[PDB]
Design a protein around this ligand. Structure first.
Ligand SMILES: Nc1ncnc2c1ncn2[C@@H]1O[C@H](COP(=O)(O)O)[C@@H](O)[C@H]1O
Ligand SMILES: Nc1ncnc2c1ncn2[C@@H]1O[C@H](COP(=O)(O)O)[C@@H](O)[C@H]1O
Lengths: 128, 93, 324, 333, 93, 128
């Protein structure tokens, strides 16, 4: 009962919401983890999507740099859900330190471009 | 283990509803129940001032309906030893 | 050691403290920063400023990931004023609402009411360097900006206000107590060629004073020069949010009737007061400026935060502090 | 003669009267007509509507100089429901605001809720033409348009509602006093499959009922069926006025707290009531429908203006003609 | 009449005013001044109902501020023997 | 937000410069207009009465050429303040000979449209 809330609200059936999140990531241009069934059956970790995005302002200037975004569906109440969206930071893939590990790692400061990529996610979601 | 892909998992298409409801998502934990922007702690001087955030919510997206046709998005980050919650107001499209 | 030489010495300490601190030191440990996309309509901007209880916002250019300038009431004041002078048709003004923040800066550029580059400091430069830079333009506010080597995104950490700076000084420099030199033996503040208005003055006419002297406020006086009220550029914001530009035509008296119960008030002092008491007022409440008056409330001058800040940073006697 | 036959004589007389008059005769001597550009945004449309205390406006296509259909609460209701049932994010619904009226209509055509095209009658043509047109379109209103030969422009004179037509009759036909046959011996109205709601029913669920049955109001009952209140499609507009779409998440009970004072009230009658009292009610209050209830306000049926007007214009031994063509349609709340 | 042309009259453009004398346009007649759309809320709850109009004023443009970014334009005309005051709300451009 | 209607369009400043802005609006709108005539090389108030003629774009774009006849009048409301009163005097196609030399009214029907649509185009021009 207060205007700001974490994540993006959703309602309905969680598998349908998951399929929606994916279509959206797909059409915003991102890549993502995919669920893997453990001995015939899928598990709750299917609602944890690690995604990766080529940062457009970086791309426009001949830079190959990624934003790492982690998505997480939580159920607030029956039929009502939060899509939690989290920044794992950024990486120009051609530098650090000279190729030892990856995935954001190092910087952790700025909320941009994260917030600008969130705005893209939300646009896609709201126009399925 | 093969990380990233661009394909929509096939099973999530078409036949769907078999109550083998592929797991439920986790319940919302208590710490995501409240955003520090909601607590417009007003004082009488500094209006930018906020309670210190929760470390495990650094860099999580937060949102608010605007009634104005723009997105209101925010995230809290650490600058040196202090915290910046930036709220952005942005056109759609 | 004598009031004069004492102030001389306190300033030296204050100046030493200001270099020694970074702008970053001024910030609270947890703070909000509100940012506006540069492509937002003017219409939405005014609403947003209004409901977040703020009077400016940094602009973000989100194709480039670059700070894109500072939105303040000066922006609206300049363009309204331009528009009032050049159109024969009053209700044309309302088209301003459909401008995007970008084209509003574009208008201000043509007519040359706006500098070219986006004034800023690094959050870890000396506080003195931010004071100098604010003083170097007008700014009133300076963005503390950093960049992210990983992405080239500019990081707007915050936006620093001459008020916050003066309050920081107030809260941390006991030496503000030792500035007992009366305003009447200093040359700070404006003391003649004042832009005033009366209750009969049309608001559009105040608006042109604000743009022409670019100032944030005009005192309201009567025929004898007694201080009745003030009319601020933020009052104009309230007049026009929700998009009713016919309010500009209202006189000041009728416009005053629409001021929300929320109003800070008008601070006054006397020509015989001095900086110790003013720092003390700044420490414990929001002061935007002080109107200097005598015993019958006759307006004598205006002492604004930039005048105080400018005296503080530039020698005891370098600028308008030269003096007697 | 018997009560049944007296009514039948009365109805012949009202038919004759309805046929003799023109749509133009219903009009006041000096009146106002509010028109909307089809290219307006929705959010602008809701404000003007609310602001002018109207629930409808004819649309104007200004490149063409043609009438562009009639805007009613049914448009919003159908579009809101369409987006609501296919989205998993509640706030996405607020995007409807950024549609132009032209677009809103396109959405209705692509989901098959608005007909091929535009329907209207000449203002100087028989008032019965207007009633039959409304009957065949399931519309509650019909625009009076006249095409100017000089310019080709179509001149919208006004929009005619079944309320105003019925009120016109009640004021010009003493023969309404001779309609004394009771409703239960009549076949008029709806007595089964009633869309109803409770105080705990969420507004988005009422909206879906509104659209699916294509109705303008939904009675509110408790279990055991007593009449408590009513939730109108117009109350929905008010809720979503000024862009606040989360109000759709409210329960009916919660939404009624937000609804302005309505004098007049909610009109009820019993199964044994007859058309004559209903006409006297029509002349001194804005009846949009009557809810049929028992001893203990148990809801048994609904008699709305369309039910009364369709019954009246359909003639000997009650046709059965009547109502015919595309019998769902957009038209016309 | 019959003169319809281009462009702007030579005087008015270039240049050398002060004027010739150039006269002042007529004063505003009192039969303007009042517009029948101005009766607020409007009576018996018809509401669409207006006072009969002043004849001299059929088809004069009338205008009002909307606060919503659209034109509000009206004009009363005669149909057969009755009077239509149509008020249109239109986007700019 | 529902306030006061007023005839015409409000204007202010200097009557000739206003008249000069009205003439330009007409030409940007593509309308044709009367110009003033001097009683020696001297002028009369009638200067503030224009009466224009407008090719009707939805007629042009069809199989016809029909004109709308619109007469403009500048009143002074108070020194410095004016009304630009705009009045329809009808519509006329191509030798549709019943009749009226006073602009054939739009035949017998006397619709507010396309007049108000052209009024719209005028106001934009006068505002841009
Ligand atoms: N009404 C006024 N008339 C003349 N000068 C002013 C006025 N208000 C402020 N100033 C001067 O202009 C500068 C900036 O004013 P402010 O907008 O209060 O920060 C200061 O040096 C003021 O003394
Ligand atoms: N709540 C309802 N449930 C079922 N049918 C209804 C309901 N309300 C109205 N109807 C019927 O639908 C038609 C038109 O409804 P209305 O929207 O009241 O003009 C009439 O024949 C009504 O009797």
């Amino acid at each position: 009962r207060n205007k700001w809330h974490f994540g993006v609200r959703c309602r309905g059936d969680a598998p349908e919401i998951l399929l929606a999140v994916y279509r959206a990531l797909q059409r915003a241009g991102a890549q993502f983890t995919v669920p893997k069934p453990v001995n015939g059956k899928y598990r709750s970790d299917m609602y944890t999507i690690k995604s990766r995005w080529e940062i457009p302002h970086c791309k426009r200037e001949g830079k190959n740099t990624y934003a790492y975004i982690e998505l997480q569906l939580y159920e607030v109440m029956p039929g009502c859900f939060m899509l939690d969206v989290k920044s794992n930071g950024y990486k120009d893939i051609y530098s650090h330190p000279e190729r030892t590990a990856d995935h954001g790692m190092d910087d952790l400061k700025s909320s941009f471009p994260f917030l600008d990529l969130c705005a893209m996610l939300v646009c896609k979601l709201f126009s399925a | 283990s093969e990380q990233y892909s661009t394909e929509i998992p096939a099973f999530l298409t078409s036949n769907t509803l078999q109550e083998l409801k592929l797991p439920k998502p986790p319940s919302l934990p208590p710490h995501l129940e409240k955003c520090i922007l909601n607590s417009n702690t007003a004082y009488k001087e500094d209006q930018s001032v906020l309670p210190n955030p929760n470390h495990v919510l650094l860099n999580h997206l937060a949102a608010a309906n605007t009634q104005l046709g723009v997105l209101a998005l925010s995230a809290t980050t650490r600058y040196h030893r202090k915290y910046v919650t930036t709220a952005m107001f942005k056109n759609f499209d | 050691m004598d009031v004069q030489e004492t102030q001389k010495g306190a300033l030296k300490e204050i100046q030493a403290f200001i270099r020694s601190r970074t702008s970053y030191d001024v910030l609270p440990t947890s703070f909000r920063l509100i940012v506006f996309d540069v492509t937002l309509f003017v219409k939405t901007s005014l609403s947003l400023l209004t409901l977040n209880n703020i009077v400016s916002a940094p602009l973000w250019d989100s194709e480039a990931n670059k700070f894109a300038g500072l939105l303040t009431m000066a922006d609206f004041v300049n363009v309204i004023k331009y528009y009032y002078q050049s159109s024969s048709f009053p209700e044309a003004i309302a088209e301003i609402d459909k401008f995007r923040l970008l084209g509003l800066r574009e208008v201000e550029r043509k007519i040359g009411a706006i500098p070219p580059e986006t004034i800023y400091v690094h959050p870890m430069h000396s506080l003195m360097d931010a004071c100098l830079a604010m003083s170097k333009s007008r700014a009133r506010r300076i963005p503390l900006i950093d960049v992210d080597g990983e992405t080239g995104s500019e990081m707007i950490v915050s936006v620093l206000t001459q008020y916050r700076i003066l309050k920081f000084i107030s809260m941390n420099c006991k030496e503000t107590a030792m500035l007992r030199v009366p305003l009447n033996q200093m040359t700070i503040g404006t003391w003649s060629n004042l832009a005033t208005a009366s209750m009969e003055t049309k608001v559009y006419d105040v608006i042109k004073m604000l743009a022409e002297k670019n100032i944030s406020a005009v005192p309201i006086v009567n025929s004898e020069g007694t201080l009745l009220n003030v009319y601020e550029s933020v009052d104009v914001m309230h007049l026009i949010q929700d998009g009713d530009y016919s309010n500009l035509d209202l006189s000041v008296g009728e416009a005053l009737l629409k001021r929300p119960a929320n109003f800070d008030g008008v601070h006054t002092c006397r020509a015989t007061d001095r900086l110790d008491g003013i720092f003390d007022a700044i420490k414990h409440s929001r002061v935007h400026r002080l109107f200097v008056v005598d015993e019958n409330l006759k307006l004598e001058g205006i002492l604004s935060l930039a005048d105080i800040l400018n005296y503080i940073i530039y020698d005891k006697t370098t600028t308008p502090g030269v003096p007697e």
